[PDB]
Amino acid sequence: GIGVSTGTYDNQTTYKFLGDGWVEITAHASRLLHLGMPPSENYCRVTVHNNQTTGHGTKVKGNMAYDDTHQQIWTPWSLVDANAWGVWFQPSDWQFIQNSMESLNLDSLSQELFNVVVKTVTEQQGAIKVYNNDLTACMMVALDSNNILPYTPAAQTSETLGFYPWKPTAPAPYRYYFFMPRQLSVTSSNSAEGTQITDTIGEPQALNSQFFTIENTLPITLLRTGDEFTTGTYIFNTDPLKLTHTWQTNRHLGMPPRITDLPTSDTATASLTANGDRFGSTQTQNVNYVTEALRTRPAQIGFMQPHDNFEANRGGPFKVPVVPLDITAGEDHDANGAIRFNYGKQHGEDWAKQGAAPERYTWDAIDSAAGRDTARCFVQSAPISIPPNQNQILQREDAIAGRTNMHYTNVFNSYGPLSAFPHPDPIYPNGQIWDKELDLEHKPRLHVTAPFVCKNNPPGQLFVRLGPNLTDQFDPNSTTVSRIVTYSTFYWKGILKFKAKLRPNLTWNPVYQATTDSVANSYMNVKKWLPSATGNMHSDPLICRPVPHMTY
Amino acid sequence: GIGVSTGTYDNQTTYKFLGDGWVEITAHASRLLHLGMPPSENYCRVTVHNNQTTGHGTKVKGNMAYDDTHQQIWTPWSLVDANAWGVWFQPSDWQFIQNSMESLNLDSLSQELFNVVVKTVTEQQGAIKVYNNDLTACMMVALDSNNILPYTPAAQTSETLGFYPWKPTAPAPYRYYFFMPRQLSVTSSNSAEGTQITDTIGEPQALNSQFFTIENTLPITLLRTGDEFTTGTYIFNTDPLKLTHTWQTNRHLGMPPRITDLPTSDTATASLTANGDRFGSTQTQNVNYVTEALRTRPAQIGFMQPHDNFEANRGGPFKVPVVPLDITAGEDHDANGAIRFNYGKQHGEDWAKQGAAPERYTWDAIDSAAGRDTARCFVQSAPISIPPNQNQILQREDAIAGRTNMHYTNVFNSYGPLSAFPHPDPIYPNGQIWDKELDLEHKPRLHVTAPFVCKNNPPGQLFVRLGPNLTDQFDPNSTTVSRIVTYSTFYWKGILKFKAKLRPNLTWNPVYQATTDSVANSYMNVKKWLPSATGNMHSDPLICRPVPHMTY
Amino acid sequence: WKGILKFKAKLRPNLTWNPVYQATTDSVANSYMNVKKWLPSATGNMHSDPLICRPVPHMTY
Amino acid sequence: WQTNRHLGMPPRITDLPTSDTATASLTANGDRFGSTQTQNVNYVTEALRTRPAQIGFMQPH
Ligand SMILES: [Cl-]
Ligand SMILES: [Cl-]
Ligand code: NA
Ligand code: NA
Prior knowledge:
- The PDB classes it as virus.
- This is part of a larger assembly, with 4 copies of chain A.
- Chain A is mainly beta.
- The first copy, chain A, has one domain: Empty Capsid Viral Protein 2.
- Chain A is built from 3 helices and 29 strands.
- Chain A has helices at 85-88, 91-100, 214-217; strands at 8-9, 13-19, 22-36, 44-48, 70-80, 101-123, 129-133, 139-144, 172-178, 182-184, 199-201, 220-223, 229-230, 234-235, 241-242, 245-246, 300-301, 310-312, 317-319, 339-343, 359-363, 378-380, 393-395, 419-420, 434-435, 452-453, 461-466, 486-502, 548-549.
- In chain A, the strands form 9 sheets. In chain A, strands 2, 3, 6, 7, 13, 14, 15 and 28 form an 8-stranded antiparallel β-sheet that branches.
- In chain A, strand 18 (310-312) and strand 19 form a beta hairpin.
- The longest helix of chain A is centred in the first third of the chain and has 10 residues, at 91-100.
- Chain A is globular and about 95 Å long.
- The N and C termini of chain A lie far apart (62 Å).
- Chain C binds chain D through residues 57, 59-61, and chain D through 1-2, 7-8, 52, 55.
- Strand 1 of chain A pairs antiparallel with strand 11 of chain B.
C-alpha cells in the first residue's frame, strides 16, 4: 500500500438541525504531526529539586510558593492530546454557538492516524543534510482504552495540538508523577536568619511505588507507510453545560418589597413602608424590623472561600484550588478563583511576539451573582445591635493573630448546606473540554480545570513513538546505543460530536451578544482575528455565556 | 499502485451528430501540470498601495486611473482553471463551428487529476542539483462544490491553463479580495499645485471582514503517486449563444418607403414621393412630413453609453463597464466598449517575441447594427424645426461645463424600455466561457466578461497544493520554518460537452466565411497558425459569428 | 384585535475564520445601543429606536 | 460589501511583504496581463480593469 493515501484530511465544522431546536454539531479536526526519535531509549526516574539558596530557590526564606520539587517517570513515548476547545472550532463557530445556543453536551469521540511517513537523515559535504525514505520502517501506536496509565491532560500545560489547521504540530512527550516524600518548612523574610529551613526529599516508598510501561500494559500496533489506525467510536456520558450566566444574588431573590407609591418624576426614587411596620421575616430576632439586607432568602448564592490557602502532604506544599466565581466590583481576583494562564504560539500567543516569555491572560468568571466582595463583607456579633460599635463587628481592616495583612476573610469558609453556585465557564480556546473523575470513594462536586467530567470511563489516551532504527553494529551487553537518525510525519483526524439546543427569546429588551468591532485597541477588534501582512496569527480567549438567565 | 498509471491523456475534439442538425461536441482536454511549494506556509493579508508622488503613482495630479491599491488574502493554495475557449478547441475547430453552426450551448463538465509524481531536490558538488522520488509524499486536492469561497476567473488575468497540448502548464496561485476602505480625490494636471491630494486606506472593518481558509471549509483529499481524483459530472444550466451577428439598425426596420419608379439605368438612383405627401408616422408633430430619419420604428436597436465613466465607492475609483457593441464607421472604441487585452506566451503571444511586454489585441464587436457613431449623433430642441439654427441643436463639438473635450455624448445615457441589443461575442481563444452570477437580489441582464452565465450554481473551483514536507528538526513554538525542497507534476484531463445546431442556408448570394489565405502580412495568413523552424507557435484571436442574420 | 403573521426563515451558515459582526447591546453611556434605551423609565416611559439589521456580511461573487 | 474593485482575481503580487508593516507590489502596468475597455493606453490597472458588471449606479438627485 506504498503509493496510496490511507485517509482524508477534514477540518470542517458541520451543523445538523434535527428540529425542535436540537442541533448535532460535528467538529472535524485534522493536523499534520511531526515525531522525532526519543533522546533516550528507556524509562527514567527523574527528580527535580530547586533547593538553591539564592533567587527562586526553596532554601531562601519565604520562598515556599516557588517549590517545583517532585519525581517523575520519563517515557520514550509521546501523547497525542486534542482535549482543548481550540482544536475543534474556529473563532466564529464558538461565537455562533455562544450567541444562539443555550445548552451544550458531549456526544461521541473518534480519531485516526494515517499517511505515515518515516525518514532517515544522513550527512554530505561542502556539510549538508540529505533526507531519504525508509519504506520498511515503522511507527508504534497504542491506545489505552481502560485508562490503566496515569491520566495527563495536555491542556494544563499548553501541550495539546495546535489550534491552526494549516500549521503543523507535534505530540507532547509522555511522563507521569511518581511518589517521593517531600517536606518543606514555612518561613517569612522577616523570619530570623539563624532559623534553618528544612528542605528534604526521601527514598522511593514500598507502599506507594507504581512503575508502569507502555510495552507491558497495552497492545501495540506497528504502522508502516501503507498502514493506518482507528480508535472506533467512544460514547460520552456527561451532564449538559449551560450556555448562559446568572445574575440574581441573594439581594434579588423573591418578592421585592412593596413600594408605597410610584415615583413622581423620571428622576425620583420611591420609598417602602417603615422598617418597623413592614411585613416579612428575618433570622435575627433581636431587632423588630425587616430590611432587604436582613430579610430571609431561600438559600445562599455563592460563598466565601479560603485564600490564598496552602496545604501540605507528604508530597509538599500546594495552593488549594477554589471555585471560579465572579470577581465582583471590588475585583478580588484570588478570592474568587480567577484563572491566569500562560501559553505558546501554537495555542494563541501572537506569532509576531518575540522573546522567551509566553502570552498571559486572566480569565474572570462570566457569572455576576456568586462572587464575593471581600472588602464589603463583615460579621456582626449577636445578639445583633444596629448600628454596632467597633467591638461588635469584625471587618476587613481588623487583623488576625496580630498580622497587618491577614484578615478574617482569608481563612473564612462560608460553604454550607445552603450553598448554590454555577458551573465553571468553558474557555475557548485554551480550556480543557472533558476530564477523568478521581478514583476516590467520595468525589468532588466538580473540577476547576474542565466543564465536562466523565461519569463513566473517559476516552483513552493515544500513544506513539518511533521504532528503534538500529545500525549495523549492535551489542546488547553494552549500555552504548547507536541508532540511525530518524523522524516521521503523519496525519491525525478526529471527530467530536456535540448535542446542542437553540436558545429561547422572551425578554423585551435586546440581549447582550458577543460581537466584533473596528475601534482601534479594542479587545474585540476584528484585526485580532485576521492574518498580518506576513501571515502572523493571534487567537485570544473569547467571551462565552453572553446571554443572562433567570436564576429564580 | 506505484508502477501503474491512473488515467488517460486525451485532447481530441469529437463531433457526434444526432440528426436534425443537432450536434454533440465533446471536447477532451489534457495537460501536464507543474506545482512547486508555496513561498509561504500560511495565509497572508497583503496590501498594495501605489501612492508614489512620481511616475505612475496616485499622489501625482491627475493619476486616478493608475490606482492599484487594494488588500488581498494570499493563500498557499493554487487553482486549476480551464475556463477559457483556448483550452478546449484547436483553431480549426473554432473555425468549423463558426462557419457551419448557428447555435451553441454548454451541456456538461467533468475533470480528473492523475499520475501524480512528487520529487525532492538535494545538492551535490563540482554544485549540481539531484532529483529523487518521494514515493510516500502526497499532494492535497480540494473541490468547492457549493462555491463557498470567492469566485476567481483566471481567464481575466491570463492565468488559465496553456492553450498548447504538447506544452506543460501550471496552476495559478489562489488569492482573493479582502475589504479595505479606500479614498482618492480627483485632480487634473492643470489643477492647482498647492492643492493636496487625499490618498487614504483604512483599517479592516467589522461589518465587511471575511477571512476563509481552504482547510476549514472544504474536505481535502490526499493524493500519493498511485492515487487519482475525479469531480464527477456537472450539468450546466445556461441559455444558448447565437453564432450569427445582426446588421439591421433602426434605419433598416420594416417596410422600406415605396419608390416612385425603377431606376432607368444601372447607374441611376430612384426617388420616393415628396416628403409632404408621403404616408407614414413620426413622433415629431411640429413638421408635416415623413422621412427615413424621422419615421417611427418599433424599438431602439443599440443605445448611447456614458464613457469613460469612473465611479467611486468605499473601495476606490473604477471604470464603469460598457456593453460591447459595434464601433461603427467612426471607430469610437471606448464609446462602444471594445475590449483590449494583454496576454502571455502560454495564451497566444508569439513564442519568438522577446521582452517583458505582453502581446496586446483589441476586440471589436462583430455586430454592425447596435454601435454608436458619437461624431454623427445629435439632439434637436423641440418644438423641432428643420433646419435648426446653432442654438437649437446640441452636437459633438459643443462643450459641457466649459470643458473643450467634454461633449454631451460623454455623459449621455440612452438606455430605456425600448432598448434592444445582441449578446457579447465569445472570444477564441482568450475569452472566458462561463461565469458565476452575482449574489444580489437584482441582477444584471448580462456580463461583459463571459457569454454563458450560470443560472443556477456554477462548476466548483479545483484547488491543489503540496503537503508540507518537513525536515528532521522542527519546533512548533518557533516562527522559523524548514522544509525539504519539493515539487510535483501531474496530469489533468477535462471533458466539456456542448450542444450545437447546424445552420440553415437561404440567401441566394454566397455568405461570408472565416477563411485563411497566403497573402503576406494578412491577418489571416496560414503561416500564423503553423510552427516556425524552431517550433515557435502563435495563436491570435479568431473571428466569430461570421454569418449575418435577419433581425426583423 | 388579534392578528397572526407567519414567516418562514432559515438559520445562517458559518464559515469565516474570524468572528462576525453581531447586533449587540452595551452599558456605555450615550451609546446608540445602550440597554437603558429599551427599558422603562421610573414612571414607565418607553422608547423604541430603529434597530440595525443585516449585520452579517456575505460574498457577492 | 464587494464593489467593482473587489470582483474576481486580484492581481498577482510580485513577492510577499518583507515585514508586518510593509506593502507588496504588483508587476509594472505596462507588462501586466489583463483586459480593459479603454484601448488608448497600453496597460492594466485595478481602476481600468474590466469587471463582469456594474455594482450600484449613479442616480439623478
Ligand atoms: Cl478514542
Ligand atoms: Cl467540476
Ligand atoms: Na486578587
Ligand atoms: Na476610442
